[PDB]
Write a protein that binds this ligand. Structure first.
Ligand SMILES: CCCCCC/C=C\CCCCCCCCCCOC(C)=O
Length: 124
């Protein structure tokens, strides 16, 4: 995946997920630049779950599949983001176990990624 293909994938994942939820574009803009420092609505949390379901890296219960996420990295991120993404996944592989509710499990995993990344981090 090239960087151009990655940037395109962000918008195509957004376009598949956003229309299923009542969201604020401003909130999406913040997640897109890796800024998760605000209380998410329930729909925003479930949007992060929708995105992760599209990648196949969570199940319906919001449980994160770290082995699958790691194996899928070459298909999800460009080469220049591979090592940073691997370390993010490893740092956050168990985050979901700390929460009871499906959407929140995914949201908190994504927030954990955002805290264990570099400046290349972007969320769809
Ligand atoms: C499995 C994705 C690796 C995330 C590690 C953080 C590094 C870079 C962020 C760019 C990746 C975002 C676009 C890929 C969408 C898959 C999101 C999966 O996230 C979860 C919680 O399953």
């Amino acid at each position: 995946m090239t960087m151009e293909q990655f940037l395109t994938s962000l918008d195509m994942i957004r376009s598949g997920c956003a229309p299923k939820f009542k969201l604020k574009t401003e909130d999406l803009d913040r997640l897109r630049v890796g800024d998760f420092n605000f209380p998410p609505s329930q729909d925003l949390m479930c949007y992060t779950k929708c995105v992760s379901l599209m990648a196949g890296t969570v199940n319906k219960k919001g449980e994160f599949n770290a082995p699958k996420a790691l194996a899928q990295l070459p298909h999800l991120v460009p080469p220049e983001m591979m090592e940073m993404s691997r370390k993010s996944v490893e740092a956050c592989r168990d985050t979901h176990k700390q929460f009871k509710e499906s959407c929140e499990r995914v949201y908190q995993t994504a927030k954990c990624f955002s805290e264990n990344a570099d400046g290349q981090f972007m969320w769809p």
